[PDB]
Amino acid sequence: DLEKANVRGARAVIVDLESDSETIHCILGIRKIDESVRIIAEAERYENIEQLRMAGADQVISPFVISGRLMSRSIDDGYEAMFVQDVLAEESTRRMVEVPIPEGSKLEGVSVLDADIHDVTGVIIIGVGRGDELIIDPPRDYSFRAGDIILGIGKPEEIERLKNYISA
Amino acid sequence: ATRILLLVLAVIIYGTAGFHFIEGESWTVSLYWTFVTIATVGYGDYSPSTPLGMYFTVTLIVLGIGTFAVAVERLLEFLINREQMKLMGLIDVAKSRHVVICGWSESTLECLRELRGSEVFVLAEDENVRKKVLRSGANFVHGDPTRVSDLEKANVRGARAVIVDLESDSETIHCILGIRKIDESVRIIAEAERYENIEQLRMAGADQVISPFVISGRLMSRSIDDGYEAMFVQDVLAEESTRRMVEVPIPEGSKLEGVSVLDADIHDVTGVIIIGVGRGDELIIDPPRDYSFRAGDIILGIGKPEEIERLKNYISA
Amino acid sequence: ATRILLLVLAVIIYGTAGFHFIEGESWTVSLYWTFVTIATVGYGDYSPSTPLGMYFTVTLIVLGIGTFAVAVERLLEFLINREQMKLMGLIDVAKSRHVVICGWSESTLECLRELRGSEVFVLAEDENVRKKVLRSGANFVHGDPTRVSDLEKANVRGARAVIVDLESDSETIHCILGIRKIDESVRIIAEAERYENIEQLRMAGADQVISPFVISGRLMSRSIDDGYEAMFVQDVLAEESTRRMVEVPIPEGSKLEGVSVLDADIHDVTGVIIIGVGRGDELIIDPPRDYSFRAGDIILGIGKPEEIERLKNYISA
Amino acid sequence: ATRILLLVLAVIIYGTAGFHFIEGESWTVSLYWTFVTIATVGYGDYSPSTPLGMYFTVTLIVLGIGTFAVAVERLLEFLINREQMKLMGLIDVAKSRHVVICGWSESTLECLRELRGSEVFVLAEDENVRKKVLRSGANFVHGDPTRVSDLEKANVRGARAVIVDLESDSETIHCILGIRKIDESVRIIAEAERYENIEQLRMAGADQVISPFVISGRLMSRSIDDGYEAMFVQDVLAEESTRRMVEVPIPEGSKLEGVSVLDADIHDVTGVIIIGVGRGDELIIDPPRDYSFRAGDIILGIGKPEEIERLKNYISA
Amino acid sequence: ATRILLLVLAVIIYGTAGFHFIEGESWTVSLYWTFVTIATVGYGDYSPSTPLGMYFTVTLIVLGIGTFAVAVERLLEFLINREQMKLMGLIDVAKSRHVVICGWSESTLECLRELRGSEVFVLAEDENVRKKVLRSGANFVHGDPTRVSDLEKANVRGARAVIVDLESDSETIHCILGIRKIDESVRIIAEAERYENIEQLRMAGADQVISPFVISGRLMSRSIDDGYEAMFVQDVLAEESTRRMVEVPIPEGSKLEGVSVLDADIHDVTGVIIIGVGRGDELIIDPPRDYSFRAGDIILGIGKPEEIERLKNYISA
Ligand SMILES: [C][C][C][C]N([C][C][C][C])([C][C][C][C])[C]C1=[C][C]=C([C]([O])C2=[C][C]=[C][C]=[C]2)[C]=[C]1
Ligand SMILES: [K+]
Ligand SMILES: [K+]
Ligand SMILES: [K+]
């Protein structure tokens, strides 16, 4: 029945079902059809997160584990959920962005020390990803190459300064 | 209820007025012998030696056994009724620092693994929820959480915080509007399903609105092509595999009071990416170059759990 | 059943017939010793001395422990069976001035806030309805209210008034016909749902028909343009915010017996707009200028709570 | 089970040994003192004089209160488990002349009105059926009546007659086929819903098939024009207002043995219409004139309840 | 649960420190007296003399009745809570060679006719399952078998073999992945429904898949024309009417260690058709001429029970 919905040769296959028991079986049914298509699952419980990666999901999102861990911590202070709601969920003023580095434009081969990425733009640099590997908080001894996806948190007036700082 | 004590006092005054008027002892030793005979002790130091006392002590003993029978019948009936009412959660709540959880879902089950079992109170209405609650170790209170007179049975006026996560997004607004009539200042944490209802929960009075379905609906659509944003949210907020989003409070003194973030230099000497500071119910994300720290500030930053131990010692003095 | 009493009389007569014939003591002292030993008081003044008497006292102690065990066993079995048969509502009703409420809705949950808790008996069948009854302090009688055999279980023959409010109108006409077969004079207050069933509840035998869905059909379709009639019905009949509709009886004599409404002129004296007068199970709304009050008339009027206490003192004797 | 008795015999042998080996009195007075002490009678004529014996007495008192607590715990556990098992079915029928009723409907509620209370064991599966049976006075056995293993719980092997009225005809056939596997001699009375399954219940092993949906299927389709056939069936078989279809056997002797129906002349001397005689598991409707009566033949006749008392005197001697 | 022993020690030290400091006896004698008094024994060799000691004895008596009352109250609370949290599951398994059956169907009801009653623990969630489990002798552990937190409540880490037959097929794969997270060496016997999930149950970690719906699909499509395949499967594997499939090992010695299949000649000396041999976690179906028998090999053969008993005799030395 997954072949009727043309899961073979798609952009990505978003999988979210009524329970985690059907989410694992849907991923295992897609990997019997296409072994290269991108599966974006939705884990319900915390213990079923590593069962979706073994089943073959290329990205596992867990809403009730983030919202579970943000309910128990928002009892006394509640400043950690005020970041996730105002950046990841609503994008009130700041928003999480990911931008690529094209070929040979202002950052090819430079280190992160004299890149000065936080001052001239204003966007907080969380991590730099190279080939499905996110290096959160890259160290000072780290160079930038083409194709590296820079993951940042900033206002929309600052990301357009960042994309101008990345371009040639 | 109260007539049991009346029957106890009636049998006691009957025993004393019989023993004094038959055996001929003073009232102190007659009351002492009455309490010895009623409680079935029988020291025998003041046993009746008269035949009339020997036939009256039979009546006092059978009245004492009837008193014990009626008292234990009322005790066992009250115990069985209170344990049947505590079984299906038809009890009131008399705690004072508890966490009422209106409704039950997987997002409320994950907030029991970071709290205490007997501390929290689940206020739901379904039947299979009550069995699901006790396996996690919480206290089930049967009631309609959208009803105001059934939040008062959960003691929501004297609650530490209230976590609202109901079956639909139309009942989360009704549960919050019911609590904010009972207690204005209690802390309500809510779960918004739709994106359009986030401004309704802040207007109804939720002090912190979480929207787990808006977060996934943006992480699913931006991770179709490459998706490095959904790897950060999963590895930091969800799994805490390498990093953890930690919040540290600044105490008085603290060797960093009044300093700006230029001279603080928290990321370069410790390794924690300072996201924002918690200056008084507003999260100043990316504070400026001349922001001055204050007392009771909550620094919100991400980093390795080794890098928090180099921050929790750098922040205390 | 009562075989506990036969076993207790058997062990008493065994103790007396053993002790009097073994230890050589008279019958009254042996009876006193048996009632001391079985109930475990043990005064020790007439304890045995022969080894046969000692072995007989051991067997009497064994039989007393046994009769205490079977007595507490029968008591615990009866208490458990009763308090589980009282929990789900499989018991009969013994009250004789109570109110039976057939079915359960919000229209009968707003009725229990102006009545007592133990005075009312909800006759329903659904299991989740039963838990809704016990929160409001009422008593739950399990049964189908349409069945005549299960209306006698709620003691509807000697009830004060019966409130019929079922899940449809077809069950409401059948519940009224089931009560009028039992008692032809008990007061039935029924809730009609459709407009076509108002005349059918009165042929079924309902003494009072209250149709809330027809009121809100005439208050929704007439509040679209202006909406001034629905402000009166909400403020006087629903909320009772400023004005309130009251029923004040005329007692014996009471300073207004025989004068007309011209000689009374209640609106200038008190301020209560007299809607109608209840002379003997009828309502003369807007009584004429030559109408005269009688003893036992029910004045129906609206007014403020400070304005109605002036009417009850103007009507007192 | 018997570990309670092991504990009580251990503590009595402990008391006897620790009184004899310490106080040095005889063995029978040590056993007497142990049974006086552990039952909390306390005669005091053999109180411990040695302080080592006094510590032994405190230890024996602690062990006796402990073994009474373990006995009370075991008794409450047994009574709660057996009372909660009994309330929701789950007990095999230990009767020998009972009537099993598989399933429950209104046709098995108008059957209980001519049967006893403890004689009927309803074998059903649903939970709302359980409350309907216990109000009706019968007993409920929880089980699947289509399963052979659950028909043996109701003691269908030694039942008197088994009445089958399940949800549909598909399970009524499977219930008769399950009883006939168990015994081929018990009387099965089954309700057929459809007309085409009347021949299927009789091949399954039903002794009597009653099809009320086919009776009213033809009584509705013949009462559209005139409706006199359904005026007889409702006045004789259903309500029995004026007449009653009665069956009377012919006892031994009885002044009518061997005579033909014309010389017996039952209708014109009594007033009953003789429909047919019950000659050996076969009803001969409208018997011929040369039919001679036999002993044990059941005569089926309609008539007034005064014409049956005139019949049961004319049929007897 | 610890307040009761605290109050018991409090009233014990109150009894000692009142008897010693009012009457004036020694410490051990006052301990003996207060343990005699609180246990309602009452020897009466150390009765109080002064009336102040008499009133102290009355206070000790009423406080001892109070501590017995609160101790029986807490014991009844714990016992009713335990007996209602054991009747409907909600309990942990303490055995460590048991069999856990996740889910409940007719394919696991037949699995209880070849196992013991109280050995197996059926882990399910529905209430209709629970009354079906207890009628068949098994123990019911209420819990979601797809959840890893409720598989540890069934003690699946120390279980002997696990049987997964859940009401869907997506949950059979999920329950195996929950068990293999817990114990990577326990034996999982799963039921596959669809054909494409037999390979998905083995990659999940099931040691033995059983697909009964693939079997019936391959027999319902090959029995239309002649159907001799389904006569062998029903007579050997389902009913064992005349033939029977067995699995016999090769014990130590066994007289055939090393010979070929031609030299053993098992088909001619016993009549048992050799299908395959069990050499080390694989099945060599139809072993060739040059195959050599070893020790511990499981011989799988079909035959009559009068032929298998001569096969177990031939494999002994
Ligand atoms: C046999 C065994 C023993 C038991 N007993 C005795 C009885 C006899 C039958 C003792 C205790 C110990 C455990 C019981 C009892 C107790 C107590 C008493 C007392 O009075 C009382 C109670 C309640 C109210 C009032 C009073 C009474 C009574
Ligand atoms: K005593
Ligand atoms: K007790
Ligand atoms: K006693």
What is the spatial distance between Cα B259 and Cα D189, in angstroms, rounded to a whole number?
95
State the distance from the centre of ligand 3 to the C-alpha of C72, rounded, in angstroms.
7
Q: What is the DSSP string of D157-219?
A: GG-SEEEE--SSHHHHHHHHHHHHHH-SSSEEEEE--SSTTHHHHHHHT-SEEE-HHHHHHHH
What is the spatial distance between Cα E171 and Cα A24, in angstroms, rounded to a whole number?
9
Scanning every residue of chain E, which has its alpha carbon at the shortest distance from the alpha carbon of C76? E76
Of how many residues is chain D composed? 317
Is C in contact with A (3 or more beta carbon pairs below 8 Å)? no
**Which residues fall within 8 angstroms of residue B224, CB to CB, at 6 or more apart?**
A11, A12, A14, A38, A40
Q: What is the DSSP string of E266-317?
A: HHHHT-PEEEEEESSSS-EES--TT----TT-EEEEEE-HHHHTTHHHHT--
The amino acid occupying position E282 is E
Task: Provide the β-strand partners of residue B122.
Answer: B101, B140
| Backbone phi and psi for residue C282, each to the nearest 5 degrees, phi listed first | -140, 165
- B-chain CB neighbours of E83 within 8 Å are none
Q: Is A44 annotated as a binding residue?
A: yes
Q: What is the DSSP letter of D248?
A: E
Task: Provide the β-strand partners of residue E188.
Answer: E162
Write out the two tokens for D283.
Answer: 């009803």
What is the spatial distance between Cα C39 and Cα C27, in angstroms, rounded to a whole number?
18
State the distance from the centre of ligand 3 to the C-alpha of B54, rounded, in angstroms.
29
- B-chain CB neighbours of E48 within 8 Å are 32
- B-chain CB neighbours of C28 within 8 Å are 51, 54-55
Closest CA to B102 of B9, B168, B15: B168
Q: Is D193 annotated as a binding residue?
A: yes
Residue B242 backbone zone (phi > 0: left; psi -120 to 50: alpha; other: beta) = alpha
Write out the two tokens for C39.
Answer: 């109930």
Give chain B's contact residues with D (Cβ, < 8 Å).
40-44
3-class DSSP state for residue C289? coil
Torsion of CA C92, C93, C94, C98, to 10 degrees: -170
Q: What is the DSSP letter of C112?
A: T
Ligand 1 pocket test, candidate residues C40, C61, C70, C75, most atoms within 8 A of CB: C40
What is the spatial distance between Cα D31 and Cα D52, in angstroms, rounded to a whole number?
18
Which of D35, D76, D87 is the closest to C58 by Cβ? D35
State the distance from the centre of ligand 2 to the C-alpha of E44, rounded, in angstroms.
9
**Which residues fall within 8 angstroms of residue D234, CB to CB, at 6 or more apart?**
none
Q: Are A2 and A30 in contact (CB under 8 A)?
A: yes
HSE-CB of D297 using CA atoms within 13 angstroms:
23
Closest CA to E100 of E10, E178, E25: E178
How far A59 CA lies from chain E's nearest CA (Å)? 19
Q: Are E67 and E3 in contact (CB under 8 A)?
A: no
Q: What is the DSSP letter of B239?
A: S
Q: Which atom of ligand 1 is nearest to the CA of E39?
A: 12
What is the spatial distance between Cα A86 and Cα D211, in angstroms, rounded to a whole number?
71
Sheet holding E244-248, edge to edge: E244-248, E298-303, E273-278, E284-285
The amino acid occupying position B37 is T
Write out the two tokens for E73.
Answer: 């109250």
3-class DSSP state for residue D81? helix
Write out the two tokens for E256.
Answer: 């055939």
3-class DSSP state for residue E194? coil
Q: What is the DSSP letter of D239?
A: S
| Backbone phi and psi for residue B294, each to the nearest 5 degrees, phi listed first | -140, 180
What angle in degrees, to the nearest 10, is found between the helix axes of E51-87 and D51-87? 40
HSE-CB of A155 using CA atoms within 13 angstroms:
8
Ligand 1 pocket test, candidate residues C63, C68, C73, most atoms within 8 A of CB: C68
**Which residues fall within 8 angstroms of residue A24, CB to CB, at 6 or more apart?**
A48, A51, A52, A55, E170, E173, E174, E177
Residue that has been written with the tokens 């056997």 in this structure: D249
Scanning every residue of chain A, which has its alpha carbon at the shortest distance from the alpha carbon of B218? A89
Helix (H) or strand (E) segment spanning residue C302? strand C298-303
Rounded to a whole number of angstroms, the distance between the first and last alpha carbons of chain B is 60
Q: What is the DSSP letter of D9?
A: H
State the distance from the centre of ligand 2 to the C-alpha of B303, rounded, in angstroms.
72
Scanning every residue of chain B, which has its alpha carbon at the shortest distance from the alpha carbon of C74? B73
Residue with CA closest to ligand 1 atom 5: B40
Whole-Å CA distances, B151 to B122, C252, C309: 11, 48, 36
Radius of gyration, alpha carbons of chain E:
33
**Which residues fall within 8 angstroms of residue A148, CB to CB, at 6 or more apart?**
A100, A101, A128, A129, A130
Radius of gyration, alpha carbons of chain D:
33
Whole-Å CA distances, B201 to A69, B99, B105, B143, D277: 20, 19, 18, 22, 82
Is B in contact with E (3 or more beta carbon pairs below 8 Å)? yes
Q: What is the DSSP string of C256-268?
A: -TT-BHHHH-HHH
HEC per residue, C175-220: HHHHHHCCCCCCEEEEECCCHHHHHHHHHHCCCEEECHHHHHHHCC
Which of A11, A62, A79 is the closest to B234 by Cβ? A62
Residue A22 backbone zone (phi > 0: left; psi -120 to 50: alpha; other: beta) = alpha
Write out the two tokens for A75.
Answer: 């009892």
| Residue B8 in contact with ligand 1 by CB distance below 6 A | yes
Sheet holding D298-302, edge to edge: D246-249, D298-302, D273-278, D283-285
How far B117 CA lies from chain D's nearest CA (Å)? 27
Write out the two tokens for B129.
Answer: 């929820």
- Are B61 and C41 a contacting pair at CB < 8 A? yes
Helices (H), chain B: 3-22, 27-38, 51-87, 106-109, 127-136, 169-182, 198-204, 212-219, 229-232, 261-264, 266-269, 305-312
What is the spatial distance between Cα B82 and Cα B69, in angstroms, rounded to a whole number?
20
What is the spatial distance between Cα B184 and Cα E259, in angstroms, rounded to a whole number?
89
Task: Provide the β-strand partners of residue D210.
Answer: D191
| Backbone phi and psi for residue C266, each to the nearest 5 degrees, phi listed first | -70, -30
How far E42 CA lies from chain D's nearest CA (Å)? 5
Helices (H), chain E: 3-18, 27-38, 51-87, 106-109, 127-134, 148-151, 170-182, 198-204, 212-220, 229-232, 261-264, 266-269, 305-308, 311-314
Closest CA to B224 of A148, A147, A58: A58
Closest CA to D39 of A82, B293, C36: C36
Q: What is the DSSP letter of D297?
A: P
- Are B44 and E41 a contacting pair at CB < 8 A? no
Q: Are A154 and A122 in contact (CB under 8 A)?
A: yes
Q: What is the DSSP string of D88-154?
A: TS------SS-EEEES-SGGGTSSGGGS-STTEEEEE--SHHHHHHHHTT-EEEES-TTSHHHHTTT
What angle in degrees, to the nearest 10, is found between the helix axes of C51-85 and D51-87? 40
What is the spatial distance between Cα B115 and Cα B95, in angstroms, rounded to a whole number?
16
Q: What is the DSSP string of A93-156?
A: S-EEEEEE--TTSS-TT-BSTTT-TTTTT--EEEEEESSS-EEES--SS-B--TTPEEEEEE-H
Q: What is the DSSP string of C128-192?
A: HHHHHHHHTTPEEEES-TTSSTTTGGGT-TT-SEEEE--SSHHHHHHHHHHHHTT-SSSEEEEE-
Q: Are E272 and E301 in contact (CB under 8 A)?
A: yes
Helix (H) or strand (E) segment spanning residue C16? helix C3-22
Q: What angle is formed at CA A61 by the lines to CA A55 and CA A63, rounded to 5 degrees?
A: 130
- E-chain CB neighbours of A45 within 8 Å are 147
Residue with CA closest to ligand 1 atom 17: B39
How far B92 CA lies from chain A's nearest CA (Å)? 23
State the distance from the centre of ligand 4 to the C-alpha of D298, rounded, in angstroms.
69
| Residue B93 in contact with ligand 1 by CB distance below 6 A | no
- Are C44 and E44 a contacting pair at CB < 8 A? yes
3-class DSSP state for residue B117? coil
State the distance from the centre of ligand 1 to the C-alpha of D66, rounded, in angstroms.
16
What is the spatial distance between Cα A59 and Cα A68, in angstroms, rounded to a whole number?
20
3-class DSSP state for residue D222? coil
| Residue B42 in contact with ligand 1 by CB distance below 6 A | no
Q: Let me know how many helices (H) and strands (E) chain D has, helices first.
A: 13, 10
Is A in contact with D (3 or more beta carbon pairs below 8 Å)? no
Closest CA to E102 of E171, E33, E2: E171
The technique by which this structure was obtained is cryo-EM
Sheet holding C298-303, edge to edge: C244-249, C298-303, C273-277, C284-285
